[PDB]
Amino acid sequence: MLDFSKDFLFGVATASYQVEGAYNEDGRTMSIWDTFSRQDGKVYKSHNGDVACDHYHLYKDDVKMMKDLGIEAYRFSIAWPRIFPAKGQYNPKGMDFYKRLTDELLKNDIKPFATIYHWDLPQWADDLGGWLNREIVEWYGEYAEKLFSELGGYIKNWITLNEPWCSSFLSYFIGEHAPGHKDLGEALLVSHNLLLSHGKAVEIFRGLNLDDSKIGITLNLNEVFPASDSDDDKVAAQIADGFQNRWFLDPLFKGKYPQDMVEYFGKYAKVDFINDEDLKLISQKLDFLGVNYYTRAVVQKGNDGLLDAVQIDPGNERTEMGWEIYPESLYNILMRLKREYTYDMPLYITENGAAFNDVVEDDGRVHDEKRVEFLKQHFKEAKRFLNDGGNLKGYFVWSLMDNFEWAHGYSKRFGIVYVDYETEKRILKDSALWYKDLISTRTI
Numbered sequence: 001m002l003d004f005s006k007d008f009l010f011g012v013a014t015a016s017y018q019v020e021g022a023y024n025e026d027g028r029t030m031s032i033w034d035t036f037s038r039q040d041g042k043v044y045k046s047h048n049g050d051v052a053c054d055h056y057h058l059y060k061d062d063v064k065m066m067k068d069l070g071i072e073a074y075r076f077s078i079a080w081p082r083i084f085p086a087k088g089q090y091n092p093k094g095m096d097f098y099k100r101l102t103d104e105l106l107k108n109d110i111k112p113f114a115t116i117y118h119w120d121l122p123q124w125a126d127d128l129g130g131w132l133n134r135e136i137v138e139w140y141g142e143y144a145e146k147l148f149s150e151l152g153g154y155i156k157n158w159i160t161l162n163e164p165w166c167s168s169f170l171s172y173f174i175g176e177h178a179p180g181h182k183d184l185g186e187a188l189l190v191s192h193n194l195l196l197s198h199g200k201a202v203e204i205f206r207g208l209n210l211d212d213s214k215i216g217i218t219l220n221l222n223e224v225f226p227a228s229d230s231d232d233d234k235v236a237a238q239i240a241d242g243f244q245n246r247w248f249l250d251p252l253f254k255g256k257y258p259q260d261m262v263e264y265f266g267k268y269a270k271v272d273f274i275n276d277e278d279l280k281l282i283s284q285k286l287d288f289l290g291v292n293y294y295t296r297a298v299v300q301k302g303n304d305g306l307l308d309a310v311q312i313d314p315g316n317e318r319t320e321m322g323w324e325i326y327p328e329s330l331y332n333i334l335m336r337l338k339r340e341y342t343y344d345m346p347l348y349i350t351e352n353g354a355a356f357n358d359v360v361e362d363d364g365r366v367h368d369e370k371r372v373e374f375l376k377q378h379f380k381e382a383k384r385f386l387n388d389g390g391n392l393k394g395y396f397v398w399s400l401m402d403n404f405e406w407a408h409g410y411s412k413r414f415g416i417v418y419v420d421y422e423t424e425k426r427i428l429k430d431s432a433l434w435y436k437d438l439i440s441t442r443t444i
C-alpha cells in the first residue's frame with residue numbers, strides 16, 4: 001500500500017564547509033579548504049565559505065523549513081576545526097553548536113546522520129603532513145572518540161568519511177580539491193591512510209558499545225560502460241571501474257585491494273603501504289554503506305598512458321556539471337553491491353541530486369522542472385530496487401539548499417531550496433514541493 005514504508009527515511013544532505021559560514025567564529029580555525037580557496041586559480045572567482053548559506057546562525061529557520069517539508073532525516077557533517085582548532089585543544093563552544101543543532105533536529109522529529117569527515121581537515125593537521133602522515137590515524141581517532149562521547153546521546157547514525165576517492169585521487173593526483181597535489185604515489189598512500197583512519201574510528205566505536213547506534217562510510221560510485229565490445233575498451237572500462245569503485249569497495253568489504261589495480265598502479269608508483277594488519281583494521285564490519293550516486297561513464301581506450309581513457313559522450317541529456325542523466329545505474333549499482341560486496345547489509349543513498357540553471361522568476365518561484373523529473377526518475381529506480389528485494393533504508397537528496405560547490409564556488413546550484421546569497425533568503429523550488437508530496441503520500 002506504500003511504495004516506501006513508514007520506516008523508510010526520506011532525507012536531505014549538506015556538509016559543514018559548504019553551508020555553515022561563521023568561519024572565524026567561536027574558536028574555529030582554518031581548514032585546508034579555507035586555505036585552498038584563497039590560492040589564486042583554485043576556486044571559481046575566488047569564492048570561499050566564509051559566509052556560504054550562513055547556516056551556523058540560521059539553523060533554527062532551516063530546521064523549521066525541513067519540518068514543514070516533512071523531512072525525516074538530515075545528513076550533515078561536523079567541522080573538525082571547530083572541535084579541535086589546535087592539536088589536542090578541545091573547543092567546547094564548537095561542540096555546543098552541534099548540540100544545539102541536533103537538539104533542534106530531534107525536537108522536530110528529524111533523525112540526525114552525522115558525517116565525521118567531509119573534507120575540512122584542520123590546517124594545523126595538514127601543516128604536520130595531513131593524510132600523508134600516518135600519525136593522522138591517531139588524531140582522527142581522538143576527534144571521533146570525542147564526538148562519540150559528547151554527542152552519543154544526540155546522534156545514533158555515524159558516517160566516518162565522505163567520498164575518500166575525492167580526498168585522495170581528486171585532492172592529491174588530479175589536484176582539483178584541497179590540498180591540490182599532483183602525485184599518484186601520494187594519492188595512493190592517502191587513500192590507505194584514510195581507510196586506516198576509518199578503521200580506527202570503527203574500532204573505537206565498537207569499544208564504546210553505544211545503545212542503538214550505527215556506523216558506516218559513504219562512497220561515491222558510478223557504473224562504467226565500454227564504448228564498444230573491443231578488448232581494448234573492455235580493459236579501459238576495467239581500469240576505470242577499479243579506479244573509481246573497486247579500489248575502495250575491495251579493501252573495505254573483501255580485506256584486499258583489487259590485485260589488477262595494485263599491479264597497474266605499481267608500474268607507475270609505489271604500493272608498499274599494503275600489509276595484512278592494516279587491511280584487517282580497514283575491513284572491520286560496518287552497520288551500513290552510504291552510496292553517493294550521480295552518473296555513469298562510457299569509456300574508450302586511450303593511448304596507454306596513465307589513467308587516460310577517453311570520455312565518450314553518448315548523446316543524452318546532461319546536467320550543468322556535464323553529467324549524463326542515467327537513472328538506471330542507480331539500480332545497477334545498488335544491485336551490484338547486493339550481489340558482489342554488501343549482500344544483505346543495509347544501504348542508504350547518502351547523496352543523489354543534480355545541478356541545473358535555476359532562476360527565480362517574476363512570480364517569486366523557481367520552476368526547476370528538470371530537477372523534478374531527475375528526482376522522480378531516480379526515486380522510481382530506488383522503488384524498483386526495493387521491490388526486487390534490496391535492503392534500502394533511506395535516501396538523502398543532495399542538497400537541502402544551494403551551497404558552496406567546492407572548486408566551482410557558488411556557480412553550481414544543487415538545492416531543492418534556492419538561496420539568494422545577498423539576502424540569505426530561502427526560496428522553495430518546485431522540486432522541494434514535489435519532494436514534500438512524495439514524503440506525505442509515499443507514492444511515486
Ligand code: NA
Pocket residue numbers: 016017018019020021022023049050051052
Ligand atoms: Na562555511
Ligand code: NA
Pocket residue numbers: 037038039046047048
Ligand atoms: Na577566496
Ligand code: NA
Pocket residue numbers: 252253283284285286287
Ligand atoms: Na562491513
Ligand code: NA
Pocket residue numbers: 214287288346
Ligand atoms: Na544499519
Ligand code: NA
Pocket residue numbers: 325326327328329
Ligand atoms: Na537510465
